[PDB]
Design a protein around this ligand. Sequence first.
Ligand SMILES: [Zn+2]
Lengths: 77, 342, 342, 310
Amino acid sequence: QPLHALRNAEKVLLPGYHPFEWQPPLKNVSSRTDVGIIDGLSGLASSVDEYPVDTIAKRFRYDSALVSALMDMEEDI
Amino acid sequence: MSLQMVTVGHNIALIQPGFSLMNFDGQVFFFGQKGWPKRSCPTGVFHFDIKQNHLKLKPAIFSKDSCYLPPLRYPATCSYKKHQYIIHGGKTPNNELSDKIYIMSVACKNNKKVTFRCTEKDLVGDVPEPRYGHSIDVVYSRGKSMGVLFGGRSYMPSTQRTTEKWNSVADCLPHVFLIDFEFGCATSYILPELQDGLSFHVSIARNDTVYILGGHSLASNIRPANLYRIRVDLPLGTPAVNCTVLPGGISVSSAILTQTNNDEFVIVGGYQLENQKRMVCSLVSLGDNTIEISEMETPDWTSDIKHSKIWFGSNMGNGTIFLGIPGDNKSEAFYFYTLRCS
Amino acid sequence: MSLQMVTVGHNIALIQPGFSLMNFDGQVFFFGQKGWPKRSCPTGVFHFDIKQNHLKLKPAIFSKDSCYLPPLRYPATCSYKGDKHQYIIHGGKTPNNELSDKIYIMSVACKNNKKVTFRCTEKDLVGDVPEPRYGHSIDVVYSRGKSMGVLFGGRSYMPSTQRTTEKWNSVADCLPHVFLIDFEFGCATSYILPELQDGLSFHVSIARNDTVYILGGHSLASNIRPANLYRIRVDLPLGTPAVNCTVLPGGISVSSAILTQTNNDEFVIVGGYQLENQKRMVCSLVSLGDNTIEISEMETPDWTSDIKHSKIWFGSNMGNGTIFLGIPGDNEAFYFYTLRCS
Amino acid sequence: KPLCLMLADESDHETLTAILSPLIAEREAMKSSELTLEMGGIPRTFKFIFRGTGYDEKLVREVEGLEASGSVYICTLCDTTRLEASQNLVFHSITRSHAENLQRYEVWRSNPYHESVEELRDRVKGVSAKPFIETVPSIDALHCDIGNAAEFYKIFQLEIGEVYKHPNASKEERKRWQATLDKHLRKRMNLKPIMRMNGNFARKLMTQETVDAVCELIPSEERHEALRELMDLYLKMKPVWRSSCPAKECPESLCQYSFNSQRFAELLSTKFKYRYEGKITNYFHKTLAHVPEIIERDGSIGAWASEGNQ
DNA sequence: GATCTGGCCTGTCTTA
Ligand SMILES: [Zn+2]
């Protein structure tokens, strides 16, 4: 298959594609279930007045990552 | 007016942006290091002294009744009069804003060996939320003292704080808080002359008036040139606080206040715009009720500052002003200067 | 028999297996370094000096009419005093892996303030010239008030016909012919002896008035280290010379041995290589008479644990009954030890 | 499976906490909930029990609020000192929890009894930082093996030179001893000299043959027996903490681990006084004191190793 | 005015 077909099929495996909900709502955690690669700094202030920032980071959301991991192991279970 | 190079000893890495130098009887003491205190100094309070343009950080211990206060990166230091200082707010090494309030002092001194007495104070009432980058002053009205806290930034409320924006900050309410150091009580005053959350400002204290200078507002991303007056009164009933806006302000944030002579201060350092840095100085003269902000001759800045993007310092106290700039990393991560005004 | 550690200066990298120490009136001199000479010492001869168990190699100079010979890794050294004391160099292996065939003669031309000045003159042969080779040995012979050199066979590359690029570094032993070289004129002549049956290399030859004692060696033709010693007795009448060889009982099977003289008409030999992976560790003593020989086993030296397990080891003769040997290390590349046996 | 990638110094505490705060927040949030989702057309229910064990000792000291490894409170599982850990070697139960560390740091910060530096440090058992990550008091088998191999290697070096006979030694003697050992190992066990202790080098170094090759350098005869029994006990104790299921792959080694550990400690205390008198490392203590309890608690050491991240 | 103390260094040990 050409590259666009592969890229399109990739979206099924990445986190933020399957619906779910926690029965007790998670405190201080959003309920939206389509986030992908959240920024690592998490909205950290990067102006000139605050503490200087000299790092970069990328990461998924924890619950979405667990959901994707569990869905990747459906046939096994 | 005169700039000078100063070399630092082996523990240069313990200096980070946001430290707080404190002066006790012509002796400047370091505070607010990087990371948690190690076995080299379990307390984290150093002896900031300079001999022949050379810096050597010496450790210090506490008394048998102190409280091992954690390092803070943006507290609100304030003198008080025996002689003692007050610390409130700031960012712990775990990125946690402290709500407590601290009181440093000297317990025993001999042969240049100072033993501190850190006492924690319990604040009750209209207590301020944990903040950082604010300011606090002490006013004297009818033989009484009172703390004047204002400004500062903090995280989102516990309900509106999400992990996707866990590090987002916002300016606090423009309320004015009076703190009684004896009873340990606070009181919230809202004033109609304050509508914008202010942070990283400059505060000048007098007998009964405090003067707010410059700062930054996250709600607008603007550097307003303001000049406020807050004349706190201490009658036999309830303290009445008033405000007044004054013309002729300065547009700067994160400046450094000092005191050359009595009833006159000097402003240096700061930031005019985001990418622009304030290179000129400013003289502040005071009287009984009048104020005057003038201009002086700019110091002879070197090629290092004129092209640097960030700098951080603090008032040494005896007319001099400590200053530091970043550098290469591998190497020396920071260069450090001193600036005298007398 | 007393081992001793010997430290080294900065230029340790200039020593390699196969060097040659030459002695001129108490002073031992170095020769045969690694690579072509640099600007530190263009000549390549170094003052081998040991003091307080410490080696200090320093440069040396030549006269205004010498010949800058290349450093050789397996020459044939021998003393010659017949006047001015002088050494003889034949064969060798240039740093370009090319075998030399020219004869060089070392000699002291001048000296002052313990600074010698050499005189290296070139010498060429005529008649039956030997194939350029290494690992052989040359000695001098006196007979009826007349000197003569004896050159036994060694090993070399393939001849110019069968030498192919797929075996460009193959080595075969030269034919066992005896060469008599007249140093005064330069005429060499090849003789044939029925007793000499196979080629021999890295052997040890003992010289005397008019007879050379070839003891031990290594034969590449059959990969065997024989245990037979030879006795080449020659004579120099007014006519053509005559050579004879007779095998003798009581030989020794050693290759790459280091020989040195202890007393008048008495020699001591140290171990070499006994088998491929087996190493000769016990020493032997050679006592001469007038027409007889005698070999015995002395007390084994107090060898160290590093030598007892090292696979490769090399050295040469200093001259005062002292042996300078080295041990390879790792990655300080060699560990050099000295040995005195009176 | 990856979860976060950043470009920051591990020793940099402020940036590390600032980046890892949301992850720990979400973890602590969902550690008290249950997840439902429809796989195969049927909704299910899930509950999580998270265990942080893939941390080396340095990062454990950093996040749990302890100090560097060179201190006297060496164990992160018990609160013993260096002298007691060198005088006992056996009896040490685990009492070190996240809530306990939080309480310790609170006592340190508040100082309710009005004590000096040393007394308050003894009271808190060396806690001068606020924990932010909850970890499981376990052992990292990879770094344990590496440290034990390094320690043994050092012991080999000291045995070649007969330190028990000459307590003093220069630096060139040490250099020579190390070079001779390296040369021997290269010529016999086919091992190149390395700067820092490896993992495969550690695996290949811990054999009976290795002791056989090393004994060719020690002229003594009792030392030989000592090293043989030392290596024998260590090889008898290795599979207990290295197997993925000791209860079903090596029950004899599991049942006899206590006896073997006691004999190992007695051997070190008797015939190895020249090095292990009044001092001990971290991993020797961890192996001789805390392995059976972790086994009976979790069931398997090694399956929770930090090797996968490497 | 020699006498212990203070503090500063420094090599070793411990984890990476
Ligand atoms: Zn322990």
